[PDB]
Amino acid sequence: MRRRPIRVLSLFDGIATGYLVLKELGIKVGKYVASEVCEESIAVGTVKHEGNIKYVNDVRNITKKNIEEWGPFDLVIGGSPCNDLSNVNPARKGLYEGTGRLFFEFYHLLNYSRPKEGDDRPFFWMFENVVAMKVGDKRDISRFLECNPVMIDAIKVSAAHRARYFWGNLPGMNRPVIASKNDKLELQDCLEYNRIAKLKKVQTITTKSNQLFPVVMNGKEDVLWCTELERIFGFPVHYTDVSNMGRGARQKLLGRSWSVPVIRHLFAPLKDYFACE
Amino acid sequence: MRRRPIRVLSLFDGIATGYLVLKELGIKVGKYVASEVCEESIAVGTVKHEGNIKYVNDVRNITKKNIEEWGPFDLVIGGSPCNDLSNVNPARKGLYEGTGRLFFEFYHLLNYSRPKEGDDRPFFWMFENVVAMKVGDKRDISRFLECNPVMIDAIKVSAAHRARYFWGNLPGMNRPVIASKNDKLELQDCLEYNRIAKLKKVQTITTKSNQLFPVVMNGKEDVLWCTELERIFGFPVHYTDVSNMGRGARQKLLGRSWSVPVIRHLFAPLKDYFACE
Amino acid sequence: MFETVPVWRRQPVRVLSLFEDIKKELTSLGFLESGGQLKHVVDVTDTVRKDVEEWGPFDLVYGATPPLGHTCDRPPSWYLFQFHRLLQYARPKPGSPRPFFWMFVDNLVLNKEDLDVASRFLEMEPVTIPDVHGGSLQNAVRVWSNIPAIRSRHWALVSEEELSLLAQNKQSSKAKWPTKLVKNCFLPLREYFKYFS
Amino acid sequence: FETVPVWRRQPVRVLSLFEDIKKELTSLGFLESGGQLKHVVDVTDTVRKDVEEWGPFDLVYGATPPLGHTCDRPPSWYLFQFHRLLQYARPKPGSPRPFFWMFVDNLVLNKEDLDVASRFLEMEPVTIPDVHGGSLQNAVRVWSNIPAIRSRHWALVSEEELSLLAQNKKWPTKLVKNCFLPLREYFKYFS
């Protein structure tokens, strides 16, 4: 074989974390097809990566013919919505109703993009979701993906808790995570000038607003700025300073994000199968 | 006869435009005392320049003893508020009440800071305000400052109209402005990816939001983004992505700021008078 | 489509029937004989791919949601999603093509939004099989399947309002599965497998 | 400015801004009948050269219109212009000499206008009231470096009683004329 650029199908793409990681690793991307419906999430992916992403809309309007002509794909990634799978949402609707049932669209589209059994080309995939789901949901997801997840917490490579399950077949998914020198492991490393962290790892961040006041500046307590939020999640500073987005919109996007240092741990072994620079 | 770091007094400092320009010119700043009372405007200068600015709150609580202890000063700059001097406002209160009278605080503290007799050390100063003021107030200001202004429109070096009067004694204030080619002289130079400019020069921006829809993206109207505004004024991108500020706060701050390529022009001759890199 | 199979080597059907059991029906049209060539299971939560291979090979995979009125343990879409999962476990690997058929039936249990999910995962829109007497609609089922003549049996005359109201009154009454409606749908298959007289 | 002996006292040279205190200064023997006074009312077009060419001044007086007279200006205009022209007239630091200045307000300055007047004149005002029968009839506030003017203050008068007077209502030059008397130790008395 000869290593060629990678072709990615990103479902529930969000703020294009997947494209960010692959480009940051030095991997060539031939095609990055993203399924995402939030126009603010699409806005940041469109300009931060300058139109290299081919956005599609509802995951549920992608047909088998769509997969055939948009592809072939080498990497199918996705992190379906979580508000109906998370335990400490009292009004959760479970894996089968609400937004939780969107997982099956990933499982459906995965087998569509899966290569034939005569074809033995490299094909990797990865599905992410929350650890705080009922054991019945975690079980059913493994039954459909035909594999068990690996649990990787962002606390080991970032300054915040974020335990998430990771189903997939990526090379070395089970190898131990080790932080880099460039990873900011304590909250103080992610703050702006003249800002003191009371904690050194803050609690799992969600879409919603003394853990709500975890920094003290000039004796007074304060909330975190989005520039600091972007550092906690490992994103480039000002990654979400797009389309006049304010405090609420930027936290919503980052609140449901991937912790990119965890993703670059997962995606790093992928250099060997696809062309780099 | 030896170059020493410049010592600045900046009244109505705003978002530290004066300090930014001086450092960009490679001039060593020994002391930068800024009088400013807008909390978010002070957060910008605090973070973007990492505590090198000494903030001293209201300009009307600065005493003669304050000037002599904080000083001596080599450069005294100021741009007193404009909402009560400009033809824009039907409720305009004139130069003598409202916020227009704040000019006299600059005139007062300028005479305090001016060097004694017998001392002829270099002493530079500059006062800015709007062109769109009744002729009676423009001449009254010229009577107190004892000099006539030069008019510099940012249209010659920026991508927007911004005609402003400049009183002062800076070297080469009357010399013609000629733009660098790093300057972004038309609106299309300052826009993000996949956004088309309708004009080459946008009409002067103020603190508040046809020509209020100067960009078309994907065939539809749209307003300017915060980052696009920052480049129109010559600031670094995300210069105002500070402390959870949204579109409204950021346009308030940049709407009343200086266009920094105009300040770079005015301040540039000062390199030959103070220690530099 | 698959090809005509001559009578001499037409072999007995191997059926995997999920959630509901259609042995009494299939045996009444001569697809089974009294003796088990049909595997029946209703809780597939812990069944995996090899279990389907152990019980198999299968020539027909059947699944159906609980009868109307009988309030289910599961969410209605659960029977659709699980049927799709295990159906994939039983399909012939493309290298060895052979007659393979499948059928999913809904007794007006899936709501409107679950129907698009069903039609999307099974790659066809349902077939309305009604049970009308005296010119009035008594019952109906929705059918997805690849069985050759399955479409033609559709009643375009039955509306979605006529169906949605039918589901209203009969669940309000709160009737077991009316297997007569789907019984004739298996008949185009005896040209592929054995007939037991 | 330590005082002058009676032989060498010269006629005072005064600059009266806005209002004319010529007649008041004659009756005190500061001017002789027949002119050491320059009185301007509209100083809008006055530049430092004009104040310089008009002979060196020893006293710079300025005052706002009377309380009743409906005003041409904003009240702060008389303060700011006084401060500007005062700087033009004061001696250059190389040649110290007797120089005095006085600014007077007849309850025309607003509450906000007072704080900036005291910051620009670097002194808290002096309350010179006109009280007869135990009730306050009129009053003025003055800022000046004339030697004996602060002890002329009336602490009994308060800001409420002053503004109450202002809401209820010629220039009472009678309240300010006596404050110039400490100056006869510097300039000539004309009998």
Ligand SMILES: Nc1ncnc2c1ncn2[C@@H]1O[C@H](CSCC[C@H](N)C(=O)O)[C@@H](O)[C@H]1O
């Ligand atoms: N029906 C649908 N089709 C496609 N995307 C959807 C969708 N419903 C929700 N989404 C998107 O799926 C995302 C799930 S959160 C995942 C975010 C992403 N993995 C990241 O790293 O940023 C949300 O951003 C939401 O906008």
Ligand SMILES: Nc1ncnc2c1ncn2[C@@H]1O[C@H](CSCC[C@H](N)C(=O)O)[C@@H](O)[C@H]1O
């Ligand atoms: N009383 C006061 N004392 C000190 N600053 C004041 C003030 N009143 C208003 N200001 C500030 O003066 C500024 C005038 S706008 C001038 C901004 C500045 N030249 C720049 O380039 O950013 C405003 O930011 C306002 O916050």
